[PDB]
Copies of this chain bind each other. A is one copy, B any other.
Amino acid sequence: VAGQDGSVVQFKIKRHTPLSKLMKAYCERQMRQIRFRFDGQPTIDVFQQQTGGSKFSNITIKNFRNFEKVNINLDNKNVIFGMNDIGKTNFLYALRFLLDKEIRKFGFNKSDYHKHDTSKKIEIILTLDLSNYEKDEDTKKLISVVKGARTSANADVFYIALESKYDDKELYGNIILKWGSELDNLIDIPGRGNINALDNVFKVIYINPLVDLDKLFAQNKKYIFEESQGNESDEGILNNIKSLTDQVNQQIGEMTIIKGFQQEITSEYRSLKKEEVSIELKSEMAIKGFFSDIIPYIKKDGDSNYYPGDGRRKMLSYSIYNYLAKKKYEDKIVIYLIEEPEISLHRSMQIALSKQLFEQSTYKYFFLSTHSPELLYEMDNTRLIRVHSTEKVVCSSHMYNVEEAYGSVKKKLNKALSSALFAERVLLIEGPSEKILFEKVLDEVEPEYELNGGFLLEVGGTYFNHYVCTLNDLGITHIIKTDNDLKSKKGKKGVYELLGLNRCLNLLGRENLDEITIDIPEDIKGKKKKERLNERKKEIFKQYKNEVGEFLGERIYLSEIDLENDLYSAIGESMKRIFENEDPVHYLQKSKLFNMVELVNNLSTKDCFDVFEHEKFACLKELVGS
């Protein structure tokens, strides 16, 4: 059972048992208003009646190319990524076939069927939410076209289905669109000729990674000028320009070299064929009008020259999309399919595009397919869809949100997390000192761990809840190596909270443990104070051994004291000789960054393998995947 807000409730399942009892139990924990669906058919998702949620609920794809049977939850903004490039492309095509008239008119080939098995029926069903009818104008756009296909009982839900059965006689697959509030019976979408009622409400704008700017401006320039009002002064200027262009053509005909050529070429034509015609040389623009060849020119300020750079053309081509998005389609729902925008785009421009997609309101609904972490630097309030590396095409979906608590660290948090999304196994470490040591150890042991899908994500000062929930929902394996930490409360003396233990407990869903008090003498300071805290940490670690056992099952590796002490338990004799200090652990902790680098420099291959094979550093084995 999966809730709409992300809460997950586990229920025991029997055999030959109605689901009504489970539905009643969930309702009592939290009946007519809620709706229960499983894999897109009425873990099972729930419905929270009237919310501020997206219209798009989920999409089901059956027997379409790779997708044998796939159900993907959706939102207004959706990002699809993963190793399976064909799966990502075909997912976008399934949306185009359902909603784009131009793609749909071509029908389905034999190749478009799963395993080329034309005996199976292609199904693409999109589920929409109409609960927020009164507050959302786009919902009103949809139900105005739909008219009587809905039912008062199911006024909140709506389905748009694409159905296709291959015709072996005609070697053709016909796409038939149906819609309605009840999934069991859907009526055909009415239409006349090539268009249907659905094409009036939905507009799909496919932003291909590479586009010609002047091409894009050519089609839209017609609308841009006709829609605006034309006053009398503009009319006078319009007529004046027509006179100017007419004079240009007249002046061209007055030239001797122009008159000479067109006179003799007329004679040449007349000799060819006794036709009573004349040949004239006129400027094309002066004949069609200034509107025919008007184009935008990127004019740098302080420079009188007009230029047709290249990256600026790509950036400005987006502002045309931005400009049109504001004031072009006010009568239809516009869905943007942006596929691989990062192609031939500088990483600074990728971050600029990321801010447009997520921070701005320009693109209300879009499906973004990307390979670059930079496009996800500003991601927020978006649905992340991950296509697994398997050929079977599994899709894991997570609704990504950043809480108000993380708002101050959102920029740093997003930059780190964006790279981890394109990974199979992610190891969560605290700071750079852990990263320095683990990078050296892995380099000597498993140098190509990054190639295989490993990733070292460092998180500091925040609970692991945000990272783990995102990674777990997306199907990415997460390993956590933290240390038992005691943090002193502000303004209070001799009382510490089990910050290291609490973070791991928060992951398990348990509540935070209470703070404990530590009594130390005033004289006891420095090393004596530190070892006293270490003694309590060892005692606390032993006391909660049951919880620590639970952590190991969830791939959470909690150090007894810290990483340095665990390191000493593996290569302690080696640490003593390279440091030549009385206490290698205490010395390593004095300047964590510089001493770790010095230790890493003097580490040999055998020590790196000793650390890798040690039981305390079992997270490294999990990250590698052995």
Contacts and interface: CB of A to CB of B under 8 A. Distances in A.
20 contacts: A83-B346, A84-B309, A174-B195, A225-B257, A229-B257, A234-B257, A268-B319, A272-B318, A274-B451, A277-B299, A278-B301, A279-B296, A281-B295, A282-B294, A377-B450, A408-B601, A431-B431, A432-B460, A433-B460, A488-B590
Contacts of A105: 105-106, 194
Contact of A451 (B241, B256, B352, B487): B352
A19 interface: no
A513 interface: no
A487 B274 contact: no
A153 interface: no
A247 interface: yes
Interface in A281-315: 281-287, 290, 293-302, 306, 309-312, 315
Nearest to A490: B581
A552 interface: no
Interface string A249-281: 001101111101110110011011111111111
Contacts of A269: 315-316, 319
A258 to B, nearest CB: 7
Contacts of A160: none
B451 A439 contact: no
A457 to B, nearest CB: 12
B272 A352 contact: yes
A450 B351 contact: yes
A423 B309 contact: no
A348 interface: yes
A436 B451 contact: no
A612 to B, nearest CB: 15
Given A193-B174, A319-B269, A451-B351, A580 B490 contact: yes
Interface string A238-253: 1011001101100110
B294 A281 contact: yes
Contacts of A419: 347
Nearest to A85: B310
A477 interface: no
Contacts of A344: 85, 340, 343, 371
A225 B260 CA distance: 10
A373 interface: yes
A448 B355 contact: yes
A387 to B, nearest CB: 11
A432 B458 contact: yes
A509 interface: no
A587 B298 contact: no
Interface stretch (A43-51, A53-61, A68-76, A591-599): A591-599
A27 interface: no
* 7 A-B pairs closest in CB distance: A461-B597, A285-B285, A460-B593, A268-B319, A525-B525, A461-B593, A284-B293
A323 interface: yes
A244 B315 CA distance: 33
Nearest to A268: B319
B461 A439 contact: no
A356 interface: yes
A251 B241 contact: yes
A174 B188 contact: no
A310 B86 contact: yes
Nearest to A461: B597
Interface string A577-616: 0011110000100110111111011010000000000000
* A171, A188, A283, A318 pick with most chain B CB within 10 angstroms: A283
A411 interface: yes
A349 interface: yes
Nearest to A406: B601
A230 interface: yes
Interface string A317-358: 011101100000000000000001011111111011001100
Interface string A103-130: 0111100000000000000000000000
Interface string A385-411: 000000100000000000001001111
Contacts of A433: 460
A461 B301 contact: no
A182 interface: no
Interface string A193-216: 111000000000000000000000
Contact of A448 (B274, B462, B488, B597): B274
A282 to B, nearest CB: 5
Given A281-B294, A377-B450, 8 more contacts: A172-B195, A176-B193, A234-B255, A241-B252, A282-B297, A348-B422, A408-B597, A409-B436
Given A278-B299, A439-B412, A594 B284 contact: no
Given A256-B233, A405-B601, A283 B285 contact: yes
Contacts of A342: 371
Interface in A502-553: 525-526, 529
A237 interface: yes
A186 B192 CA distance: 14
B277 A298 contact: yes
Contacts of A554: none
A409 B597 contact: yes
A481 to B, nearest CB: 15
A233 to B, nearest CB: 7
A8 interface: no
Nearest to A529: B526
Contact of A260 (B228, B271, B306): B228
Contacts of A233: 256
A282 B191 CA distance: 42
